[PDB]
Ligand SMILES: *Cc1c(COP(=O)(O)O)cnc(C)c1O
Ligand SMILES: *Cc1c(COP(=O)(O)O)cnc(C)c1O
Ligand SMILES: *Cc1c(COP(=O)(O)O)cnc(C)c1O
């Protein structure tokens with residue numbers, strides 16, 4: 001499977017083969033888990049975790065939505081997140097904290113299963129997209145699956161069950177020949193990708209999409225701050241698929257996707273048909289920030305060493 | 306059970322006992338009435354009615370939505386509201402102006418019943434925070450009921466929600482709109498605070514609160530950044546603070562929603578400061594906000 | 603019929619009489635066409651087309667929504683538009699560019715019909731009373747509301763007919779959720795306590811007149827906010843007005859038989875309208891950039 005190595009399991013690191021849970025775990029049956037996507041980027045000062053506290057804060061916030069009790073102080077989880085990097089001797093890596101309801105009972109109500117089991121795993125990237133691919137840009141296709149209304153699934157939380165919607169949309173997009181899916185909300189407005197927030201640029205202005213039913217991305221937040229620091233005007237608005245069709249540029253953000261320009265949506269080219277200068281510039285500054293080359297953004301980094 | 310005393314009835318004051326209307330009144334059958342909630346607070350210079358002008362304007366605006374004709378000039382209603390306070394010797398009181406379609410006919414169309422009958426009555430009138438529960442009743446879409454007006458019929462929705470919330474052990478209900486976003490309480494506008502920024506909910510299908518308006522101005526004067534946004538229930542769950550505003554509720558901190566504590570689980574500093582400046586304003590202790598007060602004496 | 607005169611038909615001008623297309627044209631059966639509305643106003647320096655490039659850009663943008671191919675460069679279309687005014691001797695006129703899918707086939711899919719055929723035609727050019735329509739403007743995933751696609755106007759046509767039959771001048775469409783959207787072909791604004799409120803784009807077309815009015819309003823010193831609005835927010839507004847190439851800035855004095863403010867055209871709407879007219883007729887140096895002098 002995934003080459004994670006030593007995994008933190010409820011308080012102590014164990015070999016990957018020991019990082020297993022009962023197949024009767026509530027979360028494996030009812031999607032009652034919460035997770036985070038965190039990255040450590042190598043610097044000449046060792047690995048630096050990007051916006052660790054903001055991600056951990058969201059982790060506990062997601063748990064609160066499910067009334068899930070995480071039996072560890074945020075400080076303990078933060079230490080575990082730094083340790084999973086050190087103990088495995090990783091430089092750059094992806095970190096996946098997970099809290100899930102165990103196998104105490106299988107009634108749909110997860111309360112009797114509290115407190116939640118928790119683990120932190122991390123693994124290295126197999127490959128990265130090169131500048132050629134980034135410039136060609138991602139191709140999106142609008143999904144036939146709508147992102148869930150705000151009173152159907154908790155869209156501000158990274159709750160496991162939520163991703164059945166993301167999985168269905170992603171599979172559909174790939175089957176259609178696209179790189180990613182663009183989900184609309186039930187009313188017909190653009191929501192977000194299967195796991196990425198959307199932005200578009202028109203006549204010099206950068207438009208971030210309102211939160212609506214989307215997750216409040218930390219990369220999105222980072223990109224907006226960076227854009228403003230560079231002197232760009234940033235507006236937050238609700239958008240339709242055809243506002244994106246006629247945008248000068250479109251790009252998406254996410255911990256895994258960083259800043260990814262989108263060159264085509266529903267087989268309709270965006271602007272020049274390749275990544276545009278704004279998205280390529282934002283991506284560069286963002287990468288400079290996460291890899292510790294921007295003193296003004298060092299506050300966002302937590303050095304493991 | 307209400308100790309209203311002298312009530313202004315279509316032009317003249319009469320004892321509470323005499324303030325009655327036909328049970329064939331259109332409004333008692335079809336909810337065709339409009340009302341307001343106005344408060345008078347005691348100050349060093351006597352009772353002061355808070356934002357009288359704004360409330361009366363909305364009273365007439367609500368009537369317009371129903372194509373209801375109020376047979377009095379706003380100035381006359383304003384005098385009656387001041388008199389209801391004076392004549393009853395009130396200082397701190399709740400004032401309830403009410404215009405309703407009468408008993409001329411009972412066809413559902415209220416036009417034949419114009420002009421409306423009008424009456425004005427009044428009666429003498431935290432850190433733990435209020436507990437809310439999200440309702441199973443959604444606030445009406447903007448093309449179903451006039452959500453910007455205080456129309457009587459609208460409150461069947463509020464009544465159902467409030468009843469459900471209290472039965473569930475909460476202090477107030479939090480209504481969502483039909484699309485699933487947060488709307489407002491049964492009779493209060495909502496706000497939340499996150500990372501130092503105050504978020505006032507967009508008007509959407511909610512009533513444009515005068516207390517909400519007041520709080521925003523106060524917040525800005527204090528130096529807080531205020532953003533007007535649409536919000537989901539979980540954005541509130543993760544807020545540092547959340548509070549409600551309304552004439553009766555003033556500025557009320559909300560410490561818990563759906564049994565999920567908000568922030569520290571007790572009233573937060575921001576909501577408390579806004580409430581304090583608001584109470585200072587309505588009691589005549591803020592010169593910069595004196596324009597909002599109408600002194601009875 | 604319309605007194606268009608010489609019409610540009612896929613590259614060359616021909617008498618109106620010859621400006622015809624097969625009744626088997628895809629667009630005549632399935633609404634697969636795109637168009638624009640552009641005006642030329644007389645100025646001291648001759649006819650001037652208002653914001654020509656922005657309109658042409660939207661024309662091509664509308665085509666992209668339908669994956670329609672326009673076999674001419676924007677520059678060529680812009681020249682044709684200027685020429686339709688010159689050749690016909692027009693001073694103040696309405697210009698109607700149109701790109702439509704032809705008669706190559708009649709399967710609903712329009713791709714086999716590309717490239718589109720194109721034509722450019724032109725003709726010399728109290729407060730409105732509105733009634734809220736029983737037809738909702740289409741959701742953003744039902745019809746492309748940011749594009750001037752022919753088929754979209756069946757919705758506008760139905761709303762307009764209803765409004766007129768009800769005794770009003772124009773229709774006010776709500777979106778499916780119940781919020782105000784726009785008129786059959788005009789963007790909406792309202793004024794309350796000195797502030798001008800432009801409606802968010804939601805499912806509406808991004809009007810060029812709306813854009814011009816917002817800039818003018820800001821330049822005059824007005825505070826402008828962009829919001830979502832309900833019908834009763836309009837009922838209680840001090841003023842309500844709508845914008846569009848044909849409607850310019852039109853004040854709205856009544857909605858659903860409920861008077862707006864004074865019940866007559868208000869000062870803000872009337873002023874924006876007058877300043878807009880001054881801009882399009884070349885009397886405001888600050889807005890000269892928006893004009894294209896034909897001569
Ligand atoms: C994780 C996630 C994102 C991206 O948020 P980041 O904090 O930028 O990683 C966006 N949308 C969804 C649905 C997500 O789960
Ligand atoms: C009266 C009312 C409010 C609060 O408005 P205030 O002007 O602040 O008193 C909020 N929501 C509803 C539904 C109301 O009826
Ligand atoms: C053309 C149109 C408008 C007006 O836009 P302008 O660019 O100002 O002419 C508004 N709504 C619709 C549906 C339209 O087709």
Ligand SMILES: [Cl-]
Pocket residue numbers: 266267
């Ligand atoms: Cl397609």
Ligand SMILES: [Cl-]
Pocket residue numbers: 067563564
């Ligand atoms: Cl619960």
Ligand SMILES: [Cl-]
Pocket residue numbers: 372858859
């Ligand atoms: Cl009516």
